[PDB]
Design a protein around this ligand. Structure first.
Ligand code: HEM
Ligand code: HEM
Ligand code: 1QE
Ligand code: 1QE
Ligand code: H4B
Ligand code: H4B
Ligand code: ZN
Lengths: 407, 411
């Protein structure tokens, strides 16, 4: 009932009570743990609404005040009538920040309360979504000094009128397979990269071609738009010692901006809610470059380093991996674009876990995702027991829209 | 019910049915995951069922399910239980049981090797001296002059819980740790407490950085006794680096034989509380954890200074660079002395193949991602992108409390 979590490096023991407010399900059972699986009516809505409003008013110390009871009634009225309701701005801001605060997979949550929220609930067309996205991008980029933000498009009504950003992130690199049979640019996007052409895009057939945005307003077919290059900050990747590094030709964008998730506040579903902050370096250096099914440049970097690539036990992959990541961090820092290393991000997150244990009685956290993909055991999160549970408001996955849209 | 796991690097999907044979609890529920939590006397009552499940498994494996031999064994074990409140395993049953505990160990990356396990039956042992002899023969056989072979030695089972066999050591071979007055630590900080107990029981500590601890052995619920392992039995490897000649001057060495001596082996409801087992090291267990954990030898700073890395900013990744070098050194040193060791790329690759094999022939492989993924270079090894199902099958290896916490001293 009152669960404990221990840090094995520091012996620090925290006590979790916040999980008892857990609402949704994890996929795990008494018999089976699924911690490593990527994805395991008017009736429904009022409980959900009341729950959320209860935590709102408690957060502003007006639980059981007149306004609270008045609101619960106003929303109760609005639901019994319209079959949905609308959030006040203040509630929207609290909801979004809290969906980030509750993302158990995010190592970056020490920053949860400094989130800029752009209310795009008055938007009606793809051109309009495009304007809102551009302003989001520009605000967030801030000439390199990145600022967290989210833009919230209109809430789903009856599932026929959905706003969706078809891009999985706002800013990503094109991928094309060749007759040769291998891959140019980023293989993650091959499919999307073809949809875009399959709808109209004139691909500059290249390696790092920023993809066009593909936007669907109010359930309608979606439309192509190029984000103005001037708005897409990029960083040429070079090493502080290896001059040949530059000649690998590598660059990356500074703004990670997730665009395919669904935000749930008080039972209301926001299917287009792109959000952005900034990178931890290993997301680019370990996952984007070195994954077998991504840019997969380890072989190439290893060779230029003249390492003994003959036997796994020379650890040539690991050597190359570290230099690549030093390179990415060096570049971003040199160009004054915000970025965080994994040692610093994990130290931050331990600090935040501690803050959330005392101020709030816990912090849902998913170890499988919080431990970085390199140097795990020399970062402090490795030695930290964590409890994973689902609280609301939350961000959730949702099916790729091309599997669902009728034309 | 069938459950699927996918690999995201290769799109290979597998189907689990074995999880249906599971019964023990995970720690998790529908509302909470405890997947990253380190640790989430029986009556006739519960013993009968547990012995029957075990025997049904045993006789299916040998293709004799429902034979007269099966049925008589059941009847024999049942009489023995209601007669004496316990039973004895046949040799063949013990062998199968020990191997399957290994096979069912969801946190073990080395399981491709499960069927080649040498089992020593030490169930006639009655004293600590006899335990010392068995452990010595285990160590020498396992070591095999550097060409390591997996083995386990199984001492008598628990009876009333007042006559337990225990090895108080956490592993058969480990270095002492000594808390110095100035706050620092000499040798391995993980072993300070155990080192104090030993000293208290009368061990004269040489008080250097790599002193092999004595064995501390309890037979039959007696107070345990000290024994020094013969040093000619303890294979050690000096740690050098193939390019950095200053590495050897750091003074590092490590032992070759990892042999865990503090787990509890559960077979058909019986509890073997002393069951030391041994295999061979994955390099990262020495190079990442043993040397570079902050709560262990923690040589990272010293190695970084000698490499003259930029240590002013973590974003230099100076910790990450030094860590790869220390692990290169460890693998180089072991290979050069022809002492079996496996790197994490090779171990994890082998495990993915074991795992697919186990899905095909067995219907599953319970696996604990948190422990299988290596503590460096996680995502450039194939297990990182492997979805895994974790559940508890028996026979199994279980944790058990430290004996200094539970023991009734006699004096
Ligand atoms: C401010 C800097 C931020 C840093 C450095 C950061 C870092 C991270 C990292 C490293 C991951 C794992 C990502 C992966 O491997 O794909 C992650 C996941 C996540 N982050 Fe944060 N984050 C930040 C801001 C935010 C913001 C502003 C939001 C929401 C408003 C957010 C919501 C999430 C969610 C929902 C996931 C998991 C999504 C999934 O399950 O795939 N993050 N973040
Ligand atoms: C043959 C070579 C072997 C290799 C390379 C191997 C590798 C590993 C590694 C790397 C771990 C994680 C250890 C840690 O993080 O501290 C592990 C855990 C484990 N292994 Fe294996 N292993 C091997 C043989 C065996 C044998 C022979 C047994 C038993 C007969 C076994 C039973 C286990 C158990 C029970 C754990 C988990 C311990 C715990 O939960 O604390 N291993 N093994
Ligand atoms: N189920 C999947 N999920 C999936 C696939 C790719 C990426 C992601 C998550 C991307 C993500 C989400 C949130 C944060 C980050 N990284 C960041 N630093 C931020 C992005 C926005 C604010 S911070 C990346 C999730 C798939 C795997 C393979 C095909 S689909
Ligand atoms: N709960 C703990 N248990 C614990 C503590 C230290 C080590 C271990 C596991 C030791 C182990 C177990 C099984 C295999 C291995 N490594 C091997 N290569 C083998 C050892 C024996 C056969 S193979 C190591 C478990 C702690 C963690 C940190 C501090 S206490
Ligand atoms: C199968 C496995 O769960 C999958 O590889 C996960 C592991 N941990 C991860 N962790 C993060 N941060 N991001 C990821 O994409 C993944 N992938
Ligand atoms: C809290 C967490 O479970 C703990 O640090 C685990 C993580 N993964 C591990 N994995 C292995 N192989 N060995 C370990 O000791 C640990 N420690
Ligand atoms: Zn779980």
């Amino acid at each position: 009932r009152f669960l404990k979590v221990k840090n094995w490096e520091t012996d620090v023991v925290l006590t979790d009570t916040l999980h008892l407010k857990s609402t949704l399900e994890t996929g795990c059972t008494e018999h089976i743990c699924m911690g490593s699986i990527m994805l395991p009516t008017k009736d429904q809505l009022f409980p959900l609404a009341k729950e959320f409003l209860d935590q709102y008013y408690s957060s502003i110390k007006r639980f059981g005040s007149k306004a609270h009871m008045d609101r619960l009634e106003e929303v109760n009225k609005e639901i019994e009538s319209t079959s949905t309701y609308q959030l006040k701005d203040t509630e929207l801001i609290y909801g979004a920040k809290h969906a980030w605060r509750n993302a158990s997979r995010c190592v970056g949550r020490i920053q949860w309360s400094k989130l800029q929220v752009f209310d795009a609930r008055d938007c009606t067309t793809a051109h309009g979504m495009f304007n809102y996205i551009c302003n989001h991008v520009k605000y967030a980029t801030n000439k390199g000094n990145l600022r967290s933000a989210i833009t919230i498009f209109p809430q789903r009504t009856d599932g026929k009128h959905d706003f969706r950003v078809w891009n999985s992130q706002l800013i990503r690199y094109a991928g094309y397979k060749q007759p040769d049979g291998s891959t140019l640019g980023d293989p993650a996007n091959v499919q999307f990269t073809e949809i875009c052409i399959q709808q109209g895009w004139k691909a500059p057939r290249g390696r790092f071609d920023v993809l066009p945005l593909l936007l669907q307003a109010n359930g309608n077919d979606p439309e192509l738009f190029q984000i103005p290059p001037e708005l897409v900050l990029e960083v040429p990747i070079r090493h502080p010692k290896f001059d040949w590094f530059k000649d690998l030709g590598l660059k990356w964008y500074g703004l990670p901006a997730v665009s395919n998730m669904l935000l749930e506040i008080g039972g209301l579903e926001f299917s287009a809610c792109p959000f952005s902050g900034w990178y931890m370096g290993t997301e680019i250096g370990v996952r984007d470059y070195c994954d077998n099914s991504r840019y997969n440049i380890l072989e190439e970097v290893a060779k230029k380093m003249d390492l003994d690539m003959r036997k796994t036990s020379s650890l040539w992959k690991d050597q190359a991996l570290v230099e690549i990541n030093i390179a990415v961090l060096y570049s971003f820092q040199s160009d004054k674009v915000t970025i965080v290393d994994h040692h610093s991000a994990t130290e931050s997150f331990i600090k935040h876990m501690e803050n959330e244990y005392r101020c709030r009685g816990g912090c849902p956290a998913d170890w499988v995702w919080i431990v970085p993909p390199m140097s795990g055991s020399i970062t402090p999160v490795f030695h930290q027991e964590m409890l994973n549970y689902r609280l609301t408001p939350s961000f959730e996955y949702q099916p790729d829209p091309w599997n669902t849209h009728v034309w």
